[PDB]
Amino acid sequence: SGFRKMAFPSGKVEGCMVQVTCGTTTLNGLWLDDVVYCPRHVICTSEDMLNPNYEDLLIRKSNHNFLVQAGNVQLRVIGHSMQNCVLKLKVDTANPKTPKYKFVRIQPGQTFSVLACYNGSPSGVYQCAMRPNFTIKGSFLNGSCGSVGFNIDYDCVSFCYMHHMELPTGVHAGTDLEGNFYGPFVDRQTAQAAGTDTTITVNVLAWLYAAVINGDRWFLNRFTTTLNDFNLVAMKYNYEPLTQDHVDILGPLSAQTGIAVLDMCASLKELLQNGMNGRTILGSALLEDEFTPFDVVRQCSGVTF
Amino acid sequence: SGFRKMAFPSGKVEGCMVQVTCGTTTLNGLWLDDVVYCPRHVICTSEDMLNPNYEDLLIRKSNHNFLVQAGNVQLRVIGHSMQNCVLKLKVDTANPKTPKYKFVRIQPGQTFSVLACYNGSPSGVYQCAMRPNFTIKGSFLNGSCGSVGFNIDYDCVSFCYMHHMELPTGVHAGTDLEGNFYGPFVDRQTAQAAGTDTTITVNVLAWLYAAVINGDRWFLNRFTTTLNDFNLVAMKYNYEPLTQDHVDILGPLSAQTGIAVLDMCASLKELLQNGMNGRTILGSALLEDEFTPFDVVRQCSGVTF
Ligand SMILES: CC(=O)/C=C/[C@H](C[C@@H]1CCNC1=O)NC(=O)[C@@H]1[C@@H]2[C@H](CN1C(=O)[C@@H](NC(=O)NC(C)(C)C)C(C)(C)C)C2(C)C
């Protein structure tokens, strides 16, 4: 028992991280087979980033302008191209440590692990959720761009996020591995606002099931509710609507505990309307929404990779 | 910016995990050079664990009784011995993925990463603190024994914890890699109590500095305090005494922010005496004590490995 915010093992991704330097800008790249993926602003000076024309900057670069280092080994660049907001550098050596992998575009509410890197070297790993407003609450400093986020399923790494920028209140934004931003953001240092964030209701419910499985049951009440009545209350407290798809996804946890989803909704409604009265759930004084139903099942059942 | 509970990259440790089976008991082992380390209760049936005589059980086992599998490869066992509560299985093949490593015995209040494993395969990574009562708040299921905890410094893995058991309220206990338990515990399924836990004061202070670095400053007051007066207040709220050694260790964070440690103590004292009044610090409604001063500096400065 116990319940912790748990990241995926990072070894398969660590073997893919490299350093990319162009001019005086250095960041991280992802080396898979004979291609290195990295954010396109590696070709910018800090002044260019205020208003960059990336297509124009790239045509003035040649293969040799890109210094790619995998540990202490320089990789020779033999081609380059831009796809949306990422650069693809073809190198003359395929990465022998390439895992089975896919590129995926995750949905808001889904979680992934972030391997934060500097100078092509990994510094730490942590779990994030894609917020409804298409940002993540990460931990990133200068030089962390090109750090990637990922999920693992058996042996296959699903890369879903590449880091590009920071927004007010220490919130982070980036792209999928095809270089398309999550959310209405562009890679330019100019005023841009994220939308209002909301609480991921299905994840809060998943975490309440995690609490019951761990024996923290004080918040279970004797009532049920309708899906429509629950969603009227959730709306007031800035919670996402709960859909029938969400109910079906919570099925395994509901079947394991014998607590119908609509009964857990009745308990969540009371917590929202009355607060926690100074009590905690799984050690937390606030409701947690960065565990998916699958995260809960994985941790409570011991899924390995 | 941003501040997250961050684990070390686990790749160097993943390459060392194996499965150990003896009779019908299976758990995890740590393969370094030509030795596999694992908890000695792998030689027990579930009935033996109620009151085991490990020395007697081991003399009835031969090398061939130990099935060690590294992925799909069986490793041939060519010798065995017991050191305190761990078994050392000599195998005929040295692990080619062995990192530079050391075995260390950590002190209460220090943090480490746990790589939770089942059947020799890694399932997730998370950061833990060794509590003052020599337990950790982990997440471990049946089959997780032999999972290890570690720190990384540059290229060197310092292994400090091997998992053995669970205590009431989902708290966990284990040994260093020489098989000596942290705390007054033994590897037997019989009534044993942990001591009262306390809050790690120097870590709370380190986390308040992390908050200031991230721009969460509302709790800074205009006062100072003496070390003696602070410790009189801390005692009432079940906080560890703050020592001059702790003050010196907080030096780098104090110098970075320009906030003397004794002034931060005055702010912590007010939080303890008055509460947070429904406000949060770094997103938390409770004071956090599982970040060391070094963890804060590492994350806020981008140390890599
Ligand atoms: C080389 C490398 O490794 C780069 C990685 C960092 C990660 C950053 C650093 C700090 N924490 C991170 O996560 N990316 C950048 O520096 C990006 C690149 C410039 C500006 N930028 C920002 O992030 C900016 N944000 C900003 O202008 N925000 C609004 C749009 C006004 C909302 C600043 C935080 C610098 C002001 C872009 C957008 C081309």
Ligand SMILES: CC(=O)/C=C/[C@H](C[C@@H]1CCNC1=O)NC(=O)[C@@H]1[C@@H]2[C@H](CN1C(=O)[C@@H](NC(=O)NC(C)(C)C)C(C)(C)C)C2(C)C
């Ligand atoms: C094969 C493998 O992989 C083993 C790993 C697990 C990890 C456990 C499982 C659940 N979560 C974990 O962390 N270890 C064990 O099962 C150990 C071994 C027996 C009993 N035991 C306990 O942990 C017990 N604790 C207990 O008796 N507690 C008091 C002393 C009364 C305080 C139970 C939780 C089973 C009751 C020991 C002590 C030789």
